[PDB]
Symmetry: C3
Subunit: 147 residues, 3 copies
C-alpha cells in the first residue's frame, strides 16, 4: 500500500511523473522522425517516402541523447528513491529530495530539447544528481550497519 | 513474499520473462558481432581477425536498437507494474495489463530483429505502451490522493 | 525496513555501490569530453572553444559503451536482486550471488575503460550474468508456482 511509509506517496508521484515525461520524449522522438523524414530502419523509410529517408538527423539524435540521459539518471532514481522512502527519513527532507530531482530533470529535458545555452543543461543535470548522491550514501550507511 | 498481493505472481512471471528476453537480445548481439566480424572495440577486433574488423554493421546496429528500445520500455514497466501490483487492482484486469505488455514486447523484438514490414513494429510498441500508460495514471491518482 | 529479509542488507549494499559506480562512469565521461574537447552538442562546443569541438572521440565513445553496458546489466540486477532477496534464499548463497555480480561488474568497467586485452572484458560480463540468470530462474519458479 502507498501509506507503507510517510515519504512513499511523494516518491511515487514524482517518479511516475518522470516516467510519463520519458514517454513524452519517446513520442516527441517519433514525431520528429516523421516530420524530418529521418528513420533508423529501411522498412520504416520505404513506408514513408523511400530508402533515402533511412538517414540520421541532428534533431532526432538530440532527442535520443535526452532520452538516453533520462535512462542514465531517472532509472537509478526509481531504485534509490524507493529504498530511501522506507529508511524513515524526515518527511519534508524526503520531499525536498524528490522535488529537486523532479524539477531538475524536467528542466534538463527543456534545456536539452530547447537547445538552451551552456551550461544550463549541465547545471540541471548536476542539481538533479545531488539528491541522488545523498540518497545513495544514506542507503549505504543503513545497509552496511545491518550486515 | 510473492503472495503479498494477488497480482504480484503474474507481474513477477511476465517481468522476469521479459528480463530473460533482454538477455537473449544481448546474446544475439554478441553472436551477430562474431558472425559478421563487426566489433566496437579494437581489442576485440585484434583477437578476432585484425583491426579492420573494428567496424559498424547494419545487423549489429539493429540488435542494439532493439535492445535500447527494450531499455526505454521494459525498465519503466518493471517499476510501474511492481507498484501497480500493490494498489489492489482487479486480478483479471491486472493480468490483462501484464499479458498485453508481455505479448506486445515479445512481438516487438520479433518484428524488429525479423525486419518485418512497417508499421508492424510501431504497432507492437504502441500496444505495449497502452497498459503502461494505464498503470502510470492509476499510480498517479493513488499517490496524489495520499499526499 | 532493511531487515525485512536476511539477504536484503547485502543486496542494498552491492546495488547502491554499483549505482555509485555508474555515476562515476558518467563523471568520467564528462571529464573526458572536456579534456579531449569532444562534445555532442553545438551549444556545449561553442562554450568550450568553438563549433569544431562538436565532434566524436574514441575515448568518449568507449565511456558511453561502458555506461550503456552498465544499463543493459546493472538495471536488471536492481530488479532481480530485490525480488530475489524476498524469496528466502540461503544467506550465504544470496551473498555469493550479489558479490559475484559486484566484483564482475567493477572488473568489467576496469577492463573496458582500461582497454584490457580480449577476452577479459567479455569474461567479466559473462561471470556477472551468471548470478543474474540464476536469480531470474529462481524468481520464475516461485512466481509460476504461486499462479
Ligand atoms: C509515437 C510513435 C509510435 C513513437 C511514432 O510516432 N513513431 C513514428 C516513427 C516511425 C514510425 C512512426 C509511427 N507510425 C505508425 C504507428 C502506428 Cl501505432 C500505426 C501506424 C503507423 C504508420 O506509419 O502508419
Ligand atoms: C555472449 C557474448 C559474451 C555477448 C558474446 O558472444 N560476445 C562476443 C562479442 C565479442 C566477444 C565475443 C565473446 N568472446 C568470448 C567470450 C568469453 Cl566469455 C570467453 C572467450 C571469448 C573469446 O573471444 O574467446
Ligand atoms: C560532471 C559533468 C557535469 C558530467 C561534466 O564534467 N560535464 C562536462 C561535459 C560538457 C559540459 C561539462 C560541464 N560543464 C559545466 C558544468 C556545471 Cl555543473 C557548471 C558549469 C560548467 C561549465 O561548462 O562551465
Ligand atoms: C517533457 C518534454 C519537454 C518538451 C520541451 C521542448 C522544448 C521546445 O522548445 C523549443 O525548442 C526549439 C529548438 O528545439 C526552439 O526553436 C524554440 O524556440 C523552443 O520553443
Ligand atoms: C553530494 C553529497 C550529498 C550529501 O548527502 C548527505 O551525506 C551525509 C554524509 O554521508 C549524510 O549524513 C546525509 O544524510 C546526506 O544527505
Ligand atoms: C527473443 C529474441 C527474438 C528472436 C527473433 C528473431 C527473428 C528472426 O527472424 C528472421 O529474421 C531474418 C532477418 O533478420 C529473416 O531473414 C528470416 O526470414 C527470419 O526468420
Ligand atoms: C491510454 C490511456 C490508458 C487508460 O488508463 C485508464 O485511465 C483511467 C483514467 O485515468 C483510469 O480510471 C483507469 O483505471 C485506467 O485504466
Ligand atoms: C569505477 C570507474 C573505474 C575506472 C577504471 C579506469 C581504468 C583506467 O586505467 C587506465 O586506462 C588507460 C587507457 O584508457 C591506460 O592507458 C592506463 O594504463 C590505465 O591505468
Ligand atoms: C546459468 C544457470 C544458472 C543456474 O541457476 C540455478 O538454476 C537451477 C534450476 O533452475 C535452480 O535450482 C537454482 O536455484 C539456480 O541457482
Ligand atoms: N552520457 C553522458 C554522461 C555525462 C552527463 O550525464 N552529462 C550531462 C551534463 S553535461 C549531460 O546532460 N549530458 C548530455 C547527454 O547525456 O547527452 C554524456 O555523454 O554527456
Ligand atoms: N527511441 C525511439 C523512440 C520512439 C519509439 O520507441 N518508437 C518505436 C515505435 S516507431 C520504435 O520501435 N522505435 C525503434 C527504436 O527505438 O529503435 C526511436 O528513436 O524510435
Ligand atoms: N550491447 C552489447 C551486447 C552484448 C554484450 O553485453 N557483450 C559484452 C561482452 S562481449 C560487452 O562487454 N559488450 C560491450 C558493449 O556493450 O559495449 C554489445 O553490443 O556488445
Amino acid at each position: 500500500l502507498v501509506m507503507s511509509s510517510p515519504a512513499l506517496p511523494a516518491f511515487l508521484l514524482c517518479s511516475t511523473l518522470l516516467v510519463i515525461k520519458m514517454y513524452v520524449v519517446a513520442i516527441i522522438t517519433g514525431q520528429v522522425r516523421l516530420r524530418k523524414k529521418a528513420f533508423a530502419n529501411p522498412e520504416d523509410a520505404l513506408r514513408h517516402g523511400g530508402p533515402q529517408y533511412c538517414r540520421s538527423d541532428p534533431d532526432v539524435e538530440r532527442c535520443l541523447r535526452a532520452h538516453r540521459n533520462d535512462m542514465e539518471t531517472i532509472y537509478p532514481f526509481l531504485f534509490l528513491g524507493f529504498v530511501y522512502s522506507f529508511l524513515g527519513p524526515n518527511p519534508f527532507v524526503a520531499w525536498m529530495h524528490f522535488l529537486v530531482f523532479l524539477v531538475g530533470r524536467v528542466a534538463h529535458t527543456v534545456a536539452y530539447l530547447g537547445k538552451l545555452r551552456a551550461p544550463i543543461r549541465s547545471v540541471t543535470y548536476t542539481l538533479a544528481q545531488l539528491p541522488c548522491a545523498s540518497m545513495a550514501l544514506q542507503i549505504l550507511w543503513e545497509a552496511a550497519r545491518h550486515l
